[model samples]
Target chain A: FQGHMLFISATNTNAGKTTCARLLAQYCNACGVKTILLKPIETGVNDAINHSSDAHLFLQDNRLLDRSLTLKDISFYRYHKVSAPLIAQQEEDPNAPIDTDNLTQRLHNFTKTYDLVIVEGAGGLCVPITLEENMLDFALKLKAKMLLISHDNLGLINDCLLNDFLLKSHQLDYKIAINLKGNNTAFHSISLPYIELFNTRSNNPIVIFQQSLKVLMSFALKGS
Target chain B: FQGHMLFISATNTNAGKTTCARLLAQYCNACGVKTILLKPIETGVNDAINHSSDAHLFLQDNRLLDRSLTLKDISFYRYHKVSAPLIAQQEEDPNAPIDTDNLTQRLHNFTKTYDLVIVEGAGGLCVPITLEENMLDFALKLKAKMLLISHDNLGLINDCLLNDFLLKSHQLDYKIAINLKGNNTAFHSISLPYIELFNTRSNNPIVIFQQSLKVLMSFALKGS
Candidate 1:
């Protein structure tokens, strides 16, 4: 049977896509669902750690209820530089560019063994993978249910609206979650009131990351 | 006769829209073009200064080649809180709501005398003016050429692409400019390369803020 695939993307880099993926994975594991989290193209890996140090530690720490998952199973391409995959590959090893077909086939295969397969994107949807395509194209190729995370800050409205516009245009099955990574008071007073107004005005409403995990997973489990 | 209009917006708040607006106004003045700069909707004003403090100081500092412009002439709405006008108005005075028709008529009148009218937006394009409309809608209403200023940082690609998509979708006459506001080294190494590749691939290329003022004005003067 084909596994349910979910792609976790963000409005920007470091907008807590990885953390949210892990939490969702853990929650799935707790609920006795077979889940696998993969960051297919990860950049900025420390040389000291195994080529897969992050995934290795993540598996060790969470343990995923002692599943048979290994570091190799969790991560695909790991680059040293902290940049987009397109740039990092050029800077470090120009020879080894991302193989889109291979990557998709691998994800396709992963769906066989798991009930839910979660793939975390490296950066925001618009980040280029090759000269021609971007992260949004990758999501479309996978046909995965999408989760778009954004930082809760001053410019949240613009980022949300822009992403929302594109996502709707593409007709992707997606939801937006705000990661409260900044000052709470400021977000509540300065930023959130307008988002509330925005929700009131627009048909699509975004959810906060804190309260989103359960609802997000429920949507994922339910399917489109 | 109606004058040319340019609306300065940003990807996010504090993304150098005001500074760029000032520079463009200065350039036009230097070239002996009759230009007027108006904030129209300003927030985060220091109550200590005139109610229209920021616009007052902007007018005072630049002088705009000593044209007949006063504090009252340059600004329309000034709120003390450093937030979106929608929220700021609700917080400060709910009774004084934005009248869109009256605002548009005022703008229409301004275009009569000036050769060019440069209006600086309060925040990003998605910033709410009232419950129903946004900064982008206002720009559309004015039929102004848009200068979209974005912060040059890690998330620059996503911001630029999202805004680009919306502007193109809306069929707005717009140009994107990167503000070199953050760490230059990181931007050059991490961000610039991808943007270069993006420019190569896409038909419409974004420009840097520093190099964009002259070209932007040329486009504005030439019209659609």
Candidate 2:
């Protein structure tokens, strides 16, 4: 586990993928773990041609561990448009073709420097990085242990189960964490029983309702 | 398909399961098709002791076609508590006891009188009708074709996918209908792409966004 990477994919867009990735990196770093966060490609880059726009905060938080590192150590690709990489990169730079093999190689390069590379995807797991390539392929290619962040928003169960089926069909192991965003009552409180019932018999889902930063901190440090 | 029964089960509570059932009943009725709407077990009866209060509206709506029918024609079990039948009945009428076999017998009686028996479950798909039996088992025991109602709420996809998987695994055929509840923007619109992506690749779930009665009318008259 020390030498491996952990990927963060959400049940849907705005399921707190980037936020969870950043928090996991910060918590692991604070606990004396050598951690660096990566966003292979980020869409919705608001107002920037910045190199580390996608992972600047992650780099900033983790760089406090040791100062010599910079933005290049954070992310591999940061596109401007707020869409899948196929659409996002083309809107900004058509000449720089997205060679996923290059992205994979760059991700491989990070292994020596960090004990744990926390990679956050551009969108939901199935979100296509390109017509021929998707975020799921990227995660599998890296063979990272996954953490799926989900909110108590509407349709979460549908999104979670679909993502769950895909991961199971591929035989990838991952954890399901319900991130509590605000004080607003979570719909998960109600959906919990149904999920528990389904998981009680035979399942592809290990569900966790660790809704706080403290709980998440424990999750980040302990157990596979 | 004339003698078949259509069961309306939602992904969550208050996802407009009853409303959609009503619209579907009216659609079939207006098309010169005989439809008898049934609520097998209804809870959440207020202090009024109104007798199948939840199903009363359904009964009233369907009764416009014929005043000769009574409450016995609409629902089999009505409890006074605002909860599932297992607890709701035990707390009120323990001596009567909930015999699912009896409920099934009553439901069987309705099929001979109407071309279609429209059954709306008490709660979401997985909601327990009893401590030992759930809504899924009840619907399946009746051997009815299901119509699953979902909304644009957060976590709907999670609920939908769970129900979808269960129904598929059980080999029960069904259609996914998105019921429009209000002018408020629904969470379902965002999930459309994922649902579409799932439906396109493998074939089991057929989803329809019937936002209005006209669309439902068309659905009721369409070929199987």
Candidate 3:
């Protein structure tokens, strides 16, 4: 089976990109497909093994990757300040700026080694990773299939539509999944209707993520 | 005095857009400049007199407009369901579709009657008012200068950046104001730094809304 890569990003920070990535990685590994989770750049990393760290949450109870692959191998850029990449890099490590070409080449190298590579972005698409590049640029450079994790909250209609428009404008292959964790019933009456109507009218429906783990297996493991 | 129009919208649903609009309207009125606030499409409306209604909030304790201009004059489209305009129209008033041409012309008429007209959009820019039109299209049709209201919260960096990019792409003349209501101390360190850096790098600085009423008077009443 050839290697495949999926980039997981979110509508906002803490909108559950890691949770989706972890679930997809676990599902693929359970289906006898080797997978590895990569956290390329993360801010506010005091300790990668801390319970609060996304790296810890993703690595725990998931043996999909080789035991030798440590936290440093997965997360190449770690900053102490909990800010956007450019600011954090400036404040914490002013002497060393981000090397974009090296970072993209390194991420591309992992696609050949693993059956599936689940790459989780640091924040939303507009977040800056370097002075001249944002997350959208990095994703375009990687050329991986994308999955945008969003929420069914109050402002979701605008957030989802704006992001969908942006991704389409860039001509990227992507899917959107509404992370309904702690979702209110009002979502059905308020938010979901517009999103569904948009999909119907545009003839390009967004993939609503089913909560079941089995459903993700089919989505992640197809053609493998 | 020649009339000017300013369209007020937000990065999301509840990012204090009405607060900014009310303050701007009041400031213009205090300076002896006639101003009127228009909310074209509001989804959740059980009653016009309800204190919770946006129309009521914009009209109360502010007599900037004529006494004859009541709530009915300001709010053109009202639906009971709390959702997007298209969805609420389908569920509540499916028989009468939104007439875009009438709405725009009616709004444009206000600019001639008053010294300044503050049009408040229902939600963010991507919210659909008609099957084919969204808030962005409506604002463009009015030919109004725009004021984009945002927050200094988590995920704000991405939201602000994405919206700024969209507005620039359309070549609309606009300014962004970060409403620091209920602001956390951490915003200075975490969120505002990236936004500031992005502004400096782009050489197109966004206007950070000063919390004083006098400052907005300058912004809204300029060249009038």
Candidate 4:
């Protein structure tokens, strides 16, 4: 497998990117691939309760919390509101303000230690991760495979297509993942020929993503 | 008053743009000024029941439903699902697609009508009203004094300040209409000098907005 860094982004919220990410980590680990899941920035997290709601879940589901990863290692930025990272960071004076440079440096270290590093991005791909950067910028900078998860509901075609266009315009590997779920065949008719419409059996969109990961495994070591 | 248009936009959803817009119309009308409100592109519309939730509410509140204004006349675009206009427009095939040209052309004609035209923006100012147009673009193109209504809450300082910066960067008159409520003295301390912060007495933010409208009227007969 030529894979190392996999960035799971989505067209919108509630498209099951977290489930897909956890499954990807599980699948990689099953195949003797040392995989670690990183959320990096997870907002809507009440520090009074936990490190982060979603990051804590990510660590728990991946069995990394008590194993090797601490809450700090899993996420670099955590805030207690469902806001974009730029706004959320202002609400809290963290021990470390969202240090993107240090994050990338740490991420680079992870990629070397683990055979697979699956990163789950917050909300949507274009959502501002920092005042100056978005998820796509981080993914592109990391040279990760750009996997886009979108729902098969109405208006999803536009989101998926526009996201595809945006990812392509940024000049990266987009086709490595563009998963459209649900049985709404209307999207199937209108979906671009290049983008595949996948159905998850028994309400597991991660299965659809797992198959996509298989193709990802077949790619040769292309990027630095 | 030389003013013909005032676009009421907000920092984020539930930031009281609609309430402020309705109040502006009420205040303007009570002063013998003919005022009509527009929502333009309203999503989450179930035409089976109502043309637009916001426009219908606007009409009902102002007693304009029995007047010359049909629900269609109040909003040029309406769609199902509580999503952004760009995404909402994609979900349905209306008599015509969400046309920015027609919308702009109609808005131009609106300035010729009543003494004051109040256009309420949807969600955030950056939220695309059309694929090609954001609320700010519409506000700038119409040459309306963009009155932004933002709350005095956590993370709002950042949104309000950033929105103010965005308006200034565009070189338009973006005097941020900051509605300071609930006795939060900390935000008042850090608030920009150029931005005017008004207190909403007794839980009525609209009362605060009514005061803002008075300031708008005083400056009017100035900007054409």
Candidate 5:
């Protein structure tokens, strides 16, 4: 039987993708599902191992479970440089070309082992993971359900809609989680109508993850 | 017949209020109407007057026709600190409470001068202009139409909507301009749905403004 994989992608960096993913993973665990959170590529090493990967830190913070989760459970590729995968790879091996197929195979193996795997992509969907294939292509190859994370702020409507259109164009199943960041009152007030309209038109679930941290943690613990 | 006055406000400081106000002023001026851009109760004093007030600089950059636009054209209530009027007043004269009546009288006189006056408020609507009265209270008293400037990002939809709701609750007629700051594809794609939905549900117009300095300049020139 094929295992379920959840692909989490944010509109941009620091849009709370890791936080959301961890929460969902915690929620799933609470529901008695043996869940695993995965980050395909992590950059910029930190003092602590878990702190280095956002997904790892998220789980560690939320999951009260004392069981040790290895680095392999959270991340596949860890690069020292704080840059995109392509740039990181280029810096590491100037001669060797990026092998996307190899990376995809590794991801496939991980998916097979986990009952419910939450895979968090770096940056937006189209951001290049390797020179050969971008994140979107990699996500498609994984055959995972996509969850697009967007923040509630000015200039995000166009970005979110375009991303939805792209995902639809690619024939991918996806949902949107609108995250509210900071004290901008305008962004929060106007979000519901927009979510409602998008759902109506696209026939896609555009969920507003209010009480964001709580919801994410609950989701991560419960599994559903 | 009393001329119409319009106030432009934003959720954050430097969140494109000046740009929007400039555009709207230009829009009105393009209709061959006489209009004046006023920023009442500007605080602070600088050797370089333009550097003194954000509103003053905004007007100069957007629509001020010439250097002749006086201190009277844009009223100045001097305060050394770069803060809300209420805060400044509290620091300056704790005993002398903020005189809302005087502020309103000055604003009323300025509005009466121009056929279609455009008043740009300082920062968010809730900003305290005085200990007793905030920006919203001033707008209400002036009986001004409002044009809210917000980003097309996730958090902004709620902020914009709540502001609209508040204004509507107070029976103020207003519109919203959702500004796309740049070609941030992820943000734009994410935010597009919100913009359309807000427009559809709200009785007021929710306009989209692209990142075009040229377009802004054209609008400013028209005001000139």
Candidate 6:
């Protein structure tokens, strides 16, 4: 069987998808496995003049692979605005219609070359990629395994359940990563108990990834 | 027995906590149940600077009740930044600690004088009030009934459940308000299904409050 493509998505922005992706990619590279880290869209730019996207900044900082490489080295690198691709496109050219065929072709091409591709979706699954196609649609078309990144902060349980429901509705296989961002005891205490509760109820795999560079390294080595 | 204080909190900032408070206060006041609306803390100068802590703004716009009066109103208000108390404190003055006693005393006085004091907690229940106290602590101290203001977003089910568990653990009585913001179709489709789920699971009261000013007026008139 071909190696798996991991689609890392978050319940929302700032939910730590990039951090998870970096750790996973770094681990794969460290283990002597050829892995491709692909981000199809980027958003949340401060200055409209700045060419760099938030995802690009994060990837540049965390990606272990050499920068000077093509699709041969890394599968796909399509950087648009941080917002959904459709919105970004609309902003660039209001008359520009969404092109789903081109996006599908891009995915197909990327899948052919990469042994194990890690695709990070911008924001949540339901986040619109185009006027018609959403991140979930892209994932389904690619047939990638899903990894949902969520925060331990309040309202996460609701987010987790909705995300799980969405993935299930699409018949996508997935797991949940409860990201603990802060070091405070209250955050930990509040999150852990709920995590335990979620584990009991949920059929999908749920794992706690603590907020620390060291823990992330270990997570990468373990390779879920 | 005296009228109970109804404290509304959300799982995130700008989650309609003020609106919930206003609705409750309006409902109570319209029913000949004297009530007051206290913001306790105000942060961010305008909508662009900080939208979440703008509960005071929402209250004013809605004309819920007379603006907060007395130091009791001051005690219930807790905001130092545009975000949570912990975040604001950490940023503004990390060295200075939160004064829980003073805050508690202020809340106590409000409860004693007002028959129905509608206190709106900044952000969600887990939102840090002081270094030691959180929204839950404030609810417990005031012995207030809680109304969770949740948006009908993608990831609300798990959020509701986690909140339910936390409130239960603290032995606090509560209800759920399915906030329909702006009559969006996606929200209706996503929220209605979960509202049904919540209704089945939750023994506590569940209510649906639309964004329409007319509907709010009707609710107030009916004393619901």
- Docking model 3 quality class: medium
lDDT of 4 by residue, A1-224 (tens): 33378788876666778877776667667777777788888877776766446677777765642376667887888777566675566556534456777777777787767777778888767566655677778888878876777665544433444454455557676543445555555544443221332221112122234447655543312355
Compared with the true structure, what per-residue lDDT tens digits does model 6 show for residues A69-144? 4332222324334444555556655676555566556655655554566778776776655545677788888777
**Candidate 6 C-alpha lDDT tens digits along B1-224:** 54456677765666777766666666666666666666655443343455444454444533444444333334343434445555555556667656666655665565565566666776567555564566778788777677777766654544554465566667666766767666566755444544554466557645666533344333323322
DockQ of 1: 0.77
Chain A only TM-scores, each candidate in turn: 0.89, 0.84, 0.89, 0.79, 0.80, 0.77
lDDT of 4 at B221: 27
lDDT per residue as tens, model 5, B76-189: 565665555665566676676666677667666754555666777765676666545667788888777776677655445445544554566576666666776666554444
Q: Retained native contacts per candidate, as fractions?
A: 0.90, 0.00, 0.75, 0.00, 0.00, 0.02
In order, what DockQ does each candidate have?
0.77, 0.11, 0.74, 0.06, 0.03, 0.06
Which residue runs does candidate 2 get wrong by more than 4 Å? A15-19, A41-45, A49-59, A65-104, A122-138, A152-170, A180-224, B11-14, B41-54, B68-103, B122-138, B152-170, B180-207, B211-224
User: Model 5 Cα displacement at B80 (Å)?
Assistant: 3.2
In candidate 4, which residue ranges exceed 4 Å CA deviation?
A1-17, A27-34, A40-99, A121-222, B1-3, B8-17, B28-34, B41-52, B60-73, B76-102, B121-222
| Candidate 3 residue lDDT tens string, B27-102 | 7787887888888789888883466788878766345456676777777889988788888898898898777789
Residues B1-224, candidate 1, lDDT per residue (tens digit)? 47889899998887788788878878887787778788788888864655445587567744645556676667778788878888888989899887667777787787787788888888888888887778999999988888899888777887888889888888678899898854487888888888787788777788888877678778778743
Q: Model 1, retained fraction of real contacts? A: 0.90
**lDDT score for residue B156 of model 6:** 51
The residue pairs found clashing in candidate 3 are none
Q: Taking the tens digit of each residue's C-alpha lDDT, what string does model 1 give over A127-158?
A: 87776678889989888888998888777777
State how far residue A1 of model 4 sits from its true place (Å): 12
Query: Which candidate gets the maximum DockQ versus the true structure?
Result: 1
Chain B TM-score for the candidates in order: 0.90, 0.85, 0.90, 0.80, 0.78, 0.75
* Range of the 10 consecutive residues with the lowest summed lDDT in candidate 2 chain A: A184-193
Q: Candidate 4 vs candidate 5: which has greater TM-score?
A: 4
lDDT of 5: 0.62
The superposed Cα distance between candidate 6 and the true structure at residue B212, in angstroms, equals 2.9
At residue B4, give the lDDT of candidate 3.
81
